[PDB]
Design a protein around this ligand. Structure first.
Ligand code: AKG
Ligand code: NI
Ligand code: NI
Lengths: 299, 308
């Protein structure tokens, strides 16, 4: 239960030249985000944001179904056991902003919530060219989000309400039972070691974003976010690598850099060759392979 | 773990070939009619009937031969003379030290083109020995003389062929490791860095600890079956003469035609490594924080789609 460092009065420069390079999670207390942290009450937020349709999600596994609703009702229901309901009386809601055409364009609080945007100052921790996306994350009290990872550097700004989040090192990948970018273990707290023995060797870092706190999540770091109370956050993705290194298709910040994806493909070719020797020689030379990859491309 | 390699007597060409062989495990066979070699081949006889065919030889100043440091030097001798020296302890004449040890491993006339064959190169001697007929004729790949000074310790290597190591004279301690144990052995090519296997430097080679070793000793008359890929480490305990017979377990097509020894890995496997070295080249131009993550993705993938 390692804790992630909290730090006050950290500077633009201090961050970029001395903290950022450490490549480790870190929360930043007392940054100036503007008025937003002060005036984004459920009652204000509904008014300002508007009634544009936002794609909704309704401990989550598919035990959730997607819906849609007017932004203003999304928030108001997020706060509320909601009276009117898509599925249940004790429904829980969850927003994750997306562009107009989700497969074409990234989310961006500027373009999509202009009026609300003017209320928040994103930390100037990266260069304006490196920007990737800005995302509203509004969830209801208690919601539990599977443990995923993102390929962009991330700033998770907690604007309103509390929120627990626990993180894992990229190197605790093996113990994570990775189905793509998500991990199989839903309940982080008391995990059925029965079903997944390895999840226990994973060193977890924990921390709790209080309204106004900023959590930095380096590229590749694993993280579970549980909304202690109701609240709205925004996180900001940005390109750590030269812009050419990433996936063009990717408007979520989830697809590996092409390089990873390319070498992962030729890897499947090497295996298609190997596969034609009797299992026993195939086994042998596969292990001889991972031996190689470890000596040379590890740390 | 320290296991024993089974020792079976009166095993027949059919049992071995049908029952024992497909098990793919080490096995020693006792009491096989090896021909008269086993009683005839004294050092005096071998010098004589073996002749003066000049042979390439390993000379070493220390029992524990080493490829990392390469603490031994290639030389040549007339066969008879090699035998004669291998059987002494001290030496009148010598390449390096009065106490130096010798190792013969029979080679073809032109190693670049010719596999070694006891038949072709020591015609008179092949007369005294009846190779166990335990494989199909067509798959016979090679047959090698092995002659060593007492107390000489070769290194842990594996071979790509199946192999019958025939212990004609002297006594040989042989410990083997599974091919799955590759991860514990600190290999560099078909060789292992761990030289001292009885008193291993665990400070230097920690993983060597997880390695489960089969052990067995070879006495005159004993024949040992060493399936391909099985690591093995031999130590002639007193001066002895072995011969060994490699042969193809796979479609002859699968092997590397340029290989006259039995080391070079099946072309396909070799292929996959040139391919893989390509992936490891493209990925390599990602920052290491990243590349490292995708390496570990890669091995996770191999242990699933490609391991046993
Ligand atoms: O007998 C020896 O000295 C070594 C034999 C060996 O390594 C083999 O037959 O593969
Ligand atoms: Ni995320
Ligand atoms: Ni060998």
């Amino acid at each position: 239960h390692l804790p992630v460092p909290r730090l006050e009065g950290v500077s633009r420069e201090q961050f970029m030249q001395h903290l950022y390079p450490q490549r480790k999670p870190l929360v930043l207390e007392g940054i100036d985000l503007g008025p937003c942290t002060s005036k984004w009450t459920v009652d204000y937020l509904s008014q300002v944001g508007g009634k544009k349709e936002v794609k909704i999600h309704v401990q989550m596994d598919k035990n959730f179904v997607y819906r849609t609703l007017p932004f203003d009702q999304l928030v108001q229901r997020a706060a509320e056991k909601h009276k009117e309901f898509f599925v249940s009386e004790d429904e829980k809601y969850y927003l994750r902003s997306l562009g107009e055409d989700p497969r074409k364009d990234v989310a961006d609080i500027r373009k999509q919530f202009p009026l609300l945007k003017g209320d928040i100052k994103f930390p100037e921790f990266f260069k304006e060219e490196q920007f990737f996306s800005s995302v509203f994350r509004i969830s209801s009290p208690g919601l539990q989000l599977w443990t995923h990872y993102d390929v962009m550097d991330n700033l998770l700004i907690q604007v309103t309400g509390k929120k627990r989040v626990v993180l894992f090192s990229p190197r605790d990948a093996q113990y994570l039972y990775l189905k793509g970018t998500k991990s199989e273990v839903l309940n982080i707290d008391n995990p059925d070691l029965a079903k997944y023995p390895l999840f226990s060797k994973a060193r977890r870092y924990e921390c709790s974003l209080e309204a106004g706190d900023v959590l930095f999540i380096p590229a590749l770091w694993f993280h579970n976010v549980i909304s202690e109370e109701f609240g709205v956050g925004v996180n900001i993705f940005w390109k750590h690598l030269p812009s050419e290194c990433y996936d063009k298709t990717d408007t979520y910040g989830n697809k590996d850099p092409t390089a990873a994806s390319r070498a992962a493909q030729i890897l499947d070719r090497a295996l298609k060759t190997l596969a034609e020797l009797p299992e026993e020689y195939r086994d042998f030379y596969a292990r001889r392979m991972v031996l190689h990859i470890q000596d040379k491309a590890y740390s």
